[PDB]
A paper describes a structure:
Isoflavonoids play important roles in plant defense and also exhibit a range of mammalian health-promoting activities. Their biosynthesis is initiated by two enzymes with unusual catalytic activities; 2-hydroxyisoflavanone synthase (2-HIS), a membrane-bound cytochrome P450 catalyzing a coupled aryl-ring migration and hydroxylation, and 2-hydroxyisoflavanone dehydratase (2-HID), a member of a large carboxylesterase family that paradoxically catalyzes dehydration of 2-hydroxyisoflavanones to isoflavone. Here we report the crystal structures of 2-HIS from Medicago truncatula and 2-HID from Pueraria lobata.
Another 2-HIS native crystal form with a P21 space group diffracted to 2.0 Å resolution, and the structure was determined using the molecular replacement method. There are two molecules in an asymmetric unit which form a dimer with extensive interactions. The heme prosthetic group was observed in the structure of 2-HIS with well-defined electron density and is located mainly between helices I and L with the I-helix on the distal side and L-helix on the proximal side, surrounded by helices C and E and the loop before helix C. Cysteine 449 acts as the 5th ligand for the iron of the heme cofactor. Remarkably, however, the location and orientation of the heme are quite different in 2-HIS compared with other P450s (e.g., human P450 2C9). The heme is moved, relative to that in human P450 2C924,25, toward helices C and E, with a distance of ~8 Å between the heme iron in the two structures, and helix C has also shifted, by ~7-8 Å. Compared with P450 2C9, the plane of the heme protoporphyrin ring in 2-HIS is tilted down ~50°. The two propionate groups also rotate ~90° towards the substrate binding pocket, a very different configuration from classical P450s, in which both propionate groups form a strong charge-charge interaction with Arg or other basic amino acids. An observed structural feature of 2-HIS is a large pocket at the edge of the heme, close to its propionate groups, and this is likely the substrate binding pocket. However, based on the present 2-HIS structure, the substrate is not able to fit on top of the heme iron, being located in a large pocket at the edge of the heme and close to its propionate groups.
Author numbering: 30 to 96, 108 to 283, 289 to 421, 431 to 434, 438 to 520
Write the structure that this text describes.
């Protein structure tokens, strides 16, 4: 018990604290340089707010222990609603009563498979035209559609809400500087953005109405025909009035759309980019798929458990390119971490990007070497056991779902990299830039452009 904060740099300035030292939009690079001098736990003042920066796994675990836990999720996204929002108590009761469980997420697999197939068919078309495909854009549409279809169904009104949610996400990303809602200003927008906002509430109200009558017709024993797929919202509506309000249902839907869907699109692109840049690993990945699954049917989500190298590839891309390089938490009460005092209300920053590249934990950390997870949650979480990860379609998409998409892509296609003067790069130049774009979520700065090439025995046997 040293009775003092973790060490801090100099100088601390009256109003801005240490903010003048943050001279890099990619904050995690600056936090590493500071960590080299001041150690694995140090204090920065974001204005008047003390902010403690940790960069070891042991420090992360200390911040997750109970005193009430000394740190909590922030409201940067809707995941914080799970422990804190009162209307999420309804979800917790469904879980404890075995009415919402892992089987609920497993039964959505056919919906997830059809969304995967849609992407493969887009790539197949680009293979036939031999035209560059914006894989970044396709992965954003894939994750956005899969979330909305799992939640609400295949109706055309859900296609409309998916396009609207993606547009809202677009307006949410332009208010971002480094972290979201930092350059936001109270303004008037325009008629274009106004129509985007006003479209959401009437569309979701109609979708809930159309799903409520399906639930009622199933409850009263009446037969239903047309769309036999059961959506996640149907499970919520089926027990909403047992013996939760419409507004609170709409609030759950808002939370379901804003928990970080884009993280899966970002991590999928980082993984594909590492595979393109590491032909040895990509060849070995296709050999596993050809051996475990074969060339006669598409990879299925049930195969992922039998694809250890594919799972190691996802872990290895997560180690090098965590979607959130800096994870934020808030101190809930005065506590002591490794002898230092952490004050109530302090912002806590986990530099997970630094840990992923630290030679103290990883042999040759700059190498994309999935074997490190073999020769010795397929991403390799901070929420306690029993928080509901097993019942969440978003966690499924971020793990088994992304692994299935990546395996399906490389099973069917070679990814050619187009060049800047009428040529396809290959093979020493067949690489993509790994430069980062600043953000809370940090994607590749350059969109992933690829010219798919159908592998031999794929068009007729698979697509
Ligand atoms: C119904 C549709 C739902 C959607 C579309 C959705 C969406 C998401 C997404 C996109 C994430 C981010 C996962 C990641 O990238 O790491 C997430 C996280 C999470 N969700 Fe959901 N969710 C849904 C329902 C639920 C439910 C019912 C629960 C019940 C407790 C739940 C609990 C969680 C938890 C605990 C996390 C955090 C997991 C972690 O950080 O490791 N979700 N959700």
């Amino acid at each position: 018990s040293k009775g003092k904060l973790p060490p801090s740099p100099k100088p601390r300035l009256p109003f801005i604290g240490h903010l003048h030292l943050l001279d890099n939009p990619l904050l995690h690079h600056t936090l590493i340089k500071l960590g080299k001098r001041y150690g694995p736990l140090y204090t920065l003042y974001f204005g008047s707010m003390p902010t403690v920066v940790a960069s070891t796994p042991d420090l992360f675990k200390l911040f997750l222990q109970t005193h009430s836990a000394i740190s909590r999720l922030t409201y940067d996204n809707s995941v914080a609603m799970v422990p804190f929002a009162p209307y999420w108590k309804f979800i917790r009761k469904l879980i404890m009563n075995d009415l919402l469980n892992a089987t609920t997420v497993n039964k959505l697999r056919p919906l997830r498979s059809r969304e995967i197939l849609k992407v493969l068919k887009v790539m197949a078309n680009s293979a036939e035209t031999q035209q560059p495909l914006d894989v970044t854009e396709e992965l954003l549409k894939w994750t956005n559609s899969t979330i909305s279809t799992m939640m609400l169904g295949e109706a055309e009104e859900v296609r409309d809400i998916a396009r609207d949610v993606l547009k809202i996400f677009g307006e949410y990303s332009v208010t971002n500087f480094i972290w979201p809602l930092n350059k936001f200003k109270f303004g008037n927008y325009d008629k274009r953005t106004e129509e985007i906002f006003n479209k959401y509430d009437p569309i979701i109200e109609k979708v809930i109405k159309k799903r409520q009558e399906i639930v009622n017709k199933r409850k009263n024993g009446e037969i239903v025909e047309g769309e036999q797929n059961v959506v996640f919202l149907d499970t919520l509506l089926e027990f909403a009035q047992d013996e939760i309000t419409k507004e609170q249902i709409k609030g759950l839907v808002v939370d379901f759309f804003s928990a970080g869907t884009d993280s899966t699109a970002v991590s999928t692109e980082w993984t594909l980019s590492e595979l393109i840049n590491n032909p040895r690993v990509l060849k070995k990945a296709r050999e596993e798929i050809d051996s475990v699954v074969g060339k006669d049917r598409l990879v299925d989500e049930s195969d992922v458990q039998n694809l250890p190298y594919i799972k190691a590839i996802v872990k290895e891309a997560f180690r090098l390119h965590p979607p959130l390089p800096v994870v934020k938490r808030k101190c809930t009460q005065e506590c002591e971490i490794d002898g230092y005092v952490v004050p109530e209300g302090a912002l806590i920053l986990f530099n997970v990007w630094a840990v992923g590249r630290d030679p103290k934990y990883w042999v040759k950390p700059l190498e994309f070497r999935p074997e490190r997870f073999i020769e010795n949650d397929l991403r390799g979480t901070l929420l306690p056991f029993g928080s509901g990860r097993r019942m969440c379609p978003g966690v499924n998409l971020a793990t088994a779902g992304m692994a299935t998409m990546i395996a399906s892509i490389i099973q069917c296609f070679d990814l050619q990299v187009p060049g800047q003067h009428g040529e396809i790069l290959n093979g020493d130049y067949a690489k993509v830039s790994m430069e980062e774009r600043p953000g809370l979520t940090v994607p590749r700065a350059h969109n992933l452009m690829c010219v798919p090439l159908a592998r031999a025995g794929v068009a007729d046997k698979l697509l």
